[PDB]
């Protein structure tokens, strides 16, 4: 029934329940990439040590994502969908990253300074130390591959230089600038190292995922990886709830997983990761 599904898709709506009051300030207009794309105020990231007196000051277009599909007693991982490579917000990004003690970044997008800077670089160059707001970041090397590079950067506060920190930026440079990759393998491998990594740093912060405007690529990237740990944590012979999963994600930041395509790359990436995980196991 047309209405049986409409009054079903209605309860799936939360944008009306959750307020996006902070991203709406005429003070954060430039702090945004898409006027329609904004972070829920509740699960949104608040730049810290700022000044309440300054209209727009502690705002960043990002949110805290959490897999509510796994238990707190089940060491599930932490992410941060977010907007990305916006020149007009690079120090906001490093304050977000610094204050959230994040060690691994997951840029699901290349550079697109197009004429100006749709997507601009927020790192230096190998052996290059750059300052960003109160923090200085140095590039210790990009360990590329055919699809995703990997720059080793150490971020330290201009105040404390002996307080060195190395964050792992896993940029993905093979995503269809106008679609979804024809193969999960890459990101499926991309997610592999990222996971093993974060897991290497005993007490690191959430995983800062993002693209231009952390929504489509960012949403897909989170749900696939999220789904990977449910299996990795619960099992292959466990029930997967992609639809229920993607929603749980949306209800945390609007826009996560925007198109139909990204909707399939997940069915592909998870049907593959599964049959390949059991293949390895020689699951007959």
């Amino acid at each position: 029934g047309f209405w049986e599904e409409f009054e079903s898709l209605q309860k799936q709506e939360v944008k009306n329940l959750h307020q996006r009051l902070e991203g709406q300030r005429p003070e954060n207009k430039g702090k945004n990439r898409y006027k329609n794309i904004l972070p829920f105020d509740h699960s949104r990231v608040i730049l810290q040590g700022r000044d309440s007196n300054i209209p727009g000051s502690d705002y960043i277009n990002a949110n805290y994502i959490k897999n509510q599909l796994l238990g707190p007693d089940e060491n599930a991982k932490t992410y941060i969908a977010s907007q990305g490579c916006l020149e007009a917000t690079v120090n906001d990004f490093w304050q977000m990253a610094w204050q959230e003690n994040s060690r691994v970044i997951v840029m699901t997008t290349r550079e697109v300074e197009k004429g100006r800077n749709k997507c601009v670089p927020y790192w230096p160059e190998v052996g290059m130390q750059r300052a960003y707001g109160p923090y200085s970041v140095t590039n210790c090397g990009e360990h590329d591959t055919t699809e995703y590079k990997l720059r080793t950067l150490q971020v330290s506060p201009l105040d404390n230089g002996d307080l060195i920190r190395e964050i792992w930026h896993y940029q993905y440079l093979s995503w269809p600038d106008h679609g979804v990759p024809s193969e999960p393998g890459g990101v499926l491998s991309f997610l592999d190292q990222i996971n093993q990594r974060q897991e290497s740093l005993p007490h690191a912060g959430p995983i800062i995922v993002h693209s231009s405007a952390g929504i489509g690529r960012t949403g897909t990237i989170i749900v696939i990886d999220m789904l990977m740990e449910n299996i990795s944590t619960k099992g292959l012979d466990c029930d997967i709830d992609i639809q229920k999963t993607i929603q749980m994600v949306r209800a945390q930041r609007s826009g996560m997983v925007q198109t139909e395509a990204q909707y399939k790359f997940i069915y592909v990436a998870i049907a593959q990761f599964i049959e390949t995980t059991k293949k390895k196991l020689e699951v007959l």
Binding site: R33, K35, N36, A88, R116, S254, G255
Partner: peptide, 10 residues
């Protein structure tokens, strides 16, 4: 003029 396009959500 920092142009663009994109967004839609939930």
């Amino acid at each position: 003029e920092d142009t663009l396009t994109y967004a839609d959500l939930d």
